[PDB]
Design a protein around this nucleic acid. Structure first.
Lengths: 92, 82, 108, 96, 92, 104, 92, 80
DNA sequence: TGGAGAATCCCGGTGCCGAGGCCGCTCAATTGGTCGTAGACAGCTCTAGCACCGCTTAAACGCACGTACGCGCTGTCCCCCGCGTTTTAACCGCCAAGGGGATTACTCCCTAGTCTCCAGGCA
DNA sequence: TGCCTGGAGACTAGGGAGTAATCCCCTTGGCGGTTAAAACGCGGGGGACAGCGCGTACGTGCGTTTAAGCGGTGCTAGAGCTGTCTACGACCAATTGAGCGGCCTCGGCACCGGGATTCTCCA
């Protein structure tokens, strides 16, 4: 029925903190965070596709929407693993 | 019919809310002003929540209606879904 | 057919590339969605989730607790400047506040 | 008898209610207030309990942030007592 | 070949103020006002369609978006004008 | 061949609003009453702003609507101020307003 | 002392002309923009839009600053009034 | 370099008298210059990002309008 | 500076309900191929952004001087804080009626898609 | 005011929603104990507020400088449009496996209660 980012946040948590768990309300807040940030970046990429008279969302629009939304060091690092994941996806 | 439930937002409750906000000393005229501010905020949020309920042709205001009514005013709430 | 490899596995990601792709296609964001857009967005979502989970685990360990509760998420978000600036108009449920008292209220 | 100086107990409540995360408004009178505010928009209305808890969390966070701004306005006037003009100035600068 | 709402603001102004002109900058302000109100109502109606699992935008979503965005008397007279126009359009 | 704007008693184009609603990525489908209703609402708001702008130009003794008149029209009406609170109008300025204790 | 100041208040509030000079502001824009890219170019309407937005922002800030100064029982604005207004509005 | 001094003391006084300020301290001007520099850095960084996405070397007025529009500072009269 | 009382914090024992792991299965992600079109690329035009000069003049700047105003100090009296006791209603647990949210199946219509042409719209 | 281009008329297709039946989650209302919390009262102390004085820092006016702005010339980067093609994404069929619902255990943590360690206030 319903879907959520409950297992992926737990996999990320066990990657980061292997000895630390998470409650139900904290997992719900993390799910709200992921959905909210997804909506922000996707809406900004939609507006950037509309500004340039384009009908495609690409990794360029996601990159510049990440640069527009996230503050400085967060934006630089998010561009770093975004480009790393796109390069590992294409090359491997 | 419900009448005068703003007095159920009591003076020690407003004192507790001010203690969370770091307020050390409270004037005696604060409580009526705070009740009016709380009533204005609740009317503003509940009006859009009821509008979202009425668009769905529902009779119950769900948690989604409140979360979207808060998100429309720039007051996003994490924890109740959405 | 060959062995089915997921789009998250070959990108080195834990977050779902295909689910992000479906939610982009069904969100009426654009007429077309490229191949690298969900990989990039899943990487950014995984990075931001890992950044909150590091500081939330640190806050849970500072309180001598194991499981992360909403209070630790509140402390993690408000104690980091970039994350507080990102979530400035966000209310964490059952989060509380940072313990902050002004100096003029402390007795001399 | 033993009595504390005025402000010691207030600072103790400040630390106590900043260390905690519980709701500071009683749930039944807030629920009744939500009912009488919602009946002026639509009658014969029902509410999920999660909706009332979301409303209470939002209202308490709004009032706590307003009291933080009110305390800043009161300290700006070289006082320790918050007065309704501090609430008025904070809501005027915020744009409400 | 730019499109603008300029001639329709001319027509509405001539409908309400026959002996009044308007400058180019004021017409640019009116065009930006029209486009901003249009994108506000269209975005709120798109969100209302997304929340209620509807793939279409009818006059009901436009009505609810108008009621959500505009203040009180403006919203009441706007939904009055919209209902009148929809009934007259279905009458013809 | 009759335009849909004339069939609704509207000066704003119904067809242009329908075209913008179709390609604006708002929904997959658009109902037939939605551009009519949206053109009516936009025409009402344009008419209200032009009403108060003409009143501001007439009360300040001019025959042309300038951005100052639009500024006075928006910031003098309360609900238009609530609609346009976070919006700046270029070359409009602000209202003449002085704090009451500064007056001699 | 104050009659020329109140005459300047009654003079400048009525007008819509820009209070910052054009060329120093344009030099400031080209100086600030140079940290983000090298050899950037600017339309004149872009610098005019930046000047209109900056002047409106500073005037709204001085309105809130004056409110803080009357709140502290003063007619002279101070940097603490500016930083209190910026703290309440969320910029500080 | 150092073009923030082009925002002169009488220009800051003109912006203050437009805002209704009757008396101004002498420490206001550097605070106002710093605040203006922060605001300009934020808006110009956003507009330069909008220009970079279009593969363009000229900051148009549209980039400034969208840069202001993201921060809730919508500006009419230029193409908003 | 020290002591009485209060408050905070620290440590051991106990249970409990929710985190977390395992199983089925299903529907949604993946794979392989097809097709049309969006976008990248190449080329050319000409708009407009920028560089520089001259003047001439409003505007910035420096300074002298006086007075309005911020700020420190003081008194006083109101009003709010701390605490004790009483009253009120919040809260928890149970006990149902039933109202309406959610699901499913079938049926209508109306909105996407497309061809043509003509009347608004703009330069 | 002449070209042009998007809107209108009209035909078809099929899926989006409308409606009726069903079923069961969960909302609302009720009763009773209990006991935590609100409410009221009251002493006193300390903070808000009015008044006063002083010393200084802005407001203001005048003379000098400076660079803003307006006009004008000229060069070229690059916005912007068009034409071509090709790679990329929608789309469809089949498959299969990852995620989600449900079930079950056990341990992290809340509670409780007693004892050591700050901590505040008055002698």
């Amino acid at each position: 029925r319903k879907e959520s980012y409950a297992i992926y946040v737990y996999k990320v948590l066990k990657q980061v903190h292997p000895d630390t768990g998470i409650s139900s309300k904290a997992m719900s807040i993390m799910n709200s965070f992921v959905n909210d940030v997804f909506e922000r970046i996707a809406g900004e990429a939609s507006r950037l596709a509309h500004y340039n008279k384009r009908s495609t969302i690409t990794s360029r629009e996601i990159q510049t929407a990440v640069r527009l939304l996230l503050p400085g060091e967060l934006a630089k690092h998010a561009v770093s693993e975004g480009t790393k994941a796109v390069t590992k996806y294409t090359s491997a | 019919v419900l009448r005068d439930n703003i007095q159920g937002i009591t003076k020690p409750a407003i004192r507790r809310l001010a203690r969370r906000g770091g307020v050390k000393r409270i004037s005696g005229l604060i409580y009526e002003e705070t009740r009016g501010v709380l009533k204005v905020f609740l009317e503003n949020v509940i009006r859009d929540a009821v509008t979202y309920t009425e668009h769905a042709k529902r009779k119950t205001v769900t948690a989604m209606d409140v979360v979207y009514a808060l998100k429309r005013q720039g007051r996003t709430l994490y924890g109740f879904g959405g | 057919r060959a062995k089915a490899k997921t789009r998250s596995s070959r990108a080195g990601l834990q977050f779902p590339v295909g689910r992000v792709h479906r939610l982009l296609r069904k969100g009426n964001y654009a007429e077309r969605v490229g191949a690298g857009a969900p990989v990039y967005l899943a990487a950014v979502l995984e990075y931001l989730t890992a950044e909150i989970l590091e500081l939330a685990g640190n806050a849970a360990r500072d309180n001598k607790k194991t499981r992360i509760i909403p209070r630790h998420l509140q402390l993690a978000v408000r104690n980091d400047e970039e994350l507080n600036k990102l979530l400035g108009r966000v209310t964490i449920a059952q989060g509380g506040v940072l313990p902050n008292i002004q100096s003029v209220l402390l007795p001399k | 008898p033993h009595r504390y100086r005025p402000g010691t107990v207030a600072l103790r409540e400040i630390r106590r209610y900043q260390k905690s995360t519980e709701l500071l408004i009683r749930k039944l009178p807030f629920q009744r207030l939500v009912r009488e505010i919602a009946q002026d928009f639509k009658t014969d209305l029902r509410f999920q309990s999660s909706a009332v808890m979301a409303l209470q969390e939002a209202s308490e966070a709004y009032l706590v942030g307003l009291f933080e701004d009110t305390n800043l306005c009161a300290i700006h006037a070289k006082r320790v007592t918050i007065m309704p003009k501090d609430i008025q100035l904070a809501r005027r600068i915020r744009g409400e």
